[PDB]
Amino acid sequence: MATVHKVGDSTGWTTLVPYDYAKWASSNKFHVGDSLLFNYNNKFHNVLQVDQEQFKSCNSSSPAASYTSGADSIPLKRPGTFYFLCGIPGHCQLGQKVEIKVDP
Amino acid sequence: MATVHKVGDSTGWTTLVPYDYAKWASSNKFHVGDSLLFNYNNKFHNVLQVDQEQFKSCNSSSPAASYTSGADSIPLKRPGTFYFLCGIPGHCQLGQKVEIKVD
Amino acid sequence: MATVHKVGDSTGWTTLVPYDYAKWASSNKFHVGDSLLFNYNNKFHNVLQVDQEQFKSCNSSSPAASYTSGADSIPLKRPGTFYFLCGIPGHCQLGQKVEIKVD
Amino acid sequence: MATVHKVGDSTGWTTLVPYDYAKWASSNKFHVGDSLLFNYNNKFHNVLQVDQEQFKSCNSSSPAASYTSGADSIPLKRPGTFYFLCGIPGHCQLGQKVEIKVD
Numbered sequence A: 001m002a003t004v005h006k007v008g009d010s011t012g013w014t015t016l017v018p019y020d021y022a023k024w025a026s027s028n029k030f031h032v033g034d035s036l037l038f039n040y041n042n043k044f045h046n047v048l049q050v051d052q053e054q055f056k057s058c059n060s061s062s063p064a065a066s067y068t069s070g071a072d073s074i075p076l077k078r079p080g081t082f083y084f085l086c087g088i089p090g091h092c093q094l095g096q097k098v099e100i101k102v103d104p
Numbered sequence B, C, D: 001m002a003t004v005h006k007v008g009d010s011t012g013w014t015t016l017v018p019y020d021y022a023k024w025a026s027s028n029k030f031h032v033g034d035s036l037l038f039n040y041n042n043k044f045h046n047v048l049q050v051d052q053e054q055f056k057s058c059n060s061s062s063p064a065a066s067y068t069s070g071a072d073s074i075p076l077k078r079p080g081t082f083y084f085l086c087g088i089p090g091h092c093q094l095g096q097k098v099e100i101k102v103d
């Protein structure tokens, strides 16, 4: 059964305090058909889908997709690794980025 | 016990022509385990899940969830009533909203 | 085959001077598969697709589609009447709107 | 006996993964009467027809035509070379551009 994964659990998608999104991802199992739910104050953050190179360098200049609702539901349709980060200046560097492994 | 319901059938989720989404919902039977499929031009529409109050007043300010893929597959995993509307300015008022009764 | 119709011909999509877009449309024959090309300075205009009611009242508050490139190519894929207007305040009232009858 | 060429085949027009559009173009033959089909998520990409100069420098400021349907069917009724690129910031630089030689 498809499952909705709330990014950061009760903490959500934020930069208010440090939060290890890599550990959040590791504590979850993502399957095709699942979705990610990003909850945040859209006056301070957004969600951008990028590739591995942009993810590692925190490059938010050329996103493959962008979400700005504050309650974005993003589908995980195929097996592989997906990368998301907040594009607001300096946020990715603060650790607001997450790698999602779908059905490895 | 496992059916995919195409919202608006072949017409999809749109405002180009008047479409009775209420009649579409009433012409279908939704059961837990089923899913909804919203097909639309995602540059011009979106799908927001909201509560009863927001649904009636067409308020798209604080949605519970926002879908923007243009082919959203939304699973119905619990009995009850669910509300969806398009948050693009004025689309909800034109009738692009739908109430789903599950189980 | 298909044909590209340049809206307003050499005059384009503008409000600089009065231009009868209805006459332009009547002098053209639109077929399924054809496209419309709107050329304009996008700092002053845009192109919105609306329904008949909104078209008649120059209501640009809830468009079905929006284009803002200044060189928009819009496909005409089905038989029927389509309506377009510029949504910048007062432009539709100046006559910057056009009804397209496809086949 | 016209032929519809689906740009990027099943992969379509995207930047999600590196895709060699140049190889795609080279592995296909385009003749007058054919058409190109660009399939993509139109909220995140577009198709702009530009000149050789703009193509090389990935300049999308003054396109000859802008397509945004997500399933653009573009007829090729003249021999020669045509240039297309995605105007979304940085996409052209990532390689989302294609040169088409007809006849």
Ligand SMILES: [Cu+2]
Residues within 6 Å of the ligand: A014, A015, A044, A045, A046, A086, A087, A088, A091, A096
């Ligand atoms: Cu942020």
Ligand SMILES: [Cu+2]
Residues within 6 Å of the ligand: B014, B015, B044, B045, B046, B086, B087, B088, B091, B096
């Ligand atoms: Cu809508």
Ligand SMILES: [Cu+2]
Residues within 6 Å of the ligand: C014, C015, C044, C045, C046, C086, C087, C088, C091, C096
């Ligand atoms: Cu105007």
Ligand SMILES: [Cu+2]
Residues within 6 Å of the ligand: D014, D015, D044, D045, D046, D086, D087, D088, D091, D096
């Ligand atoms: Cu693009």
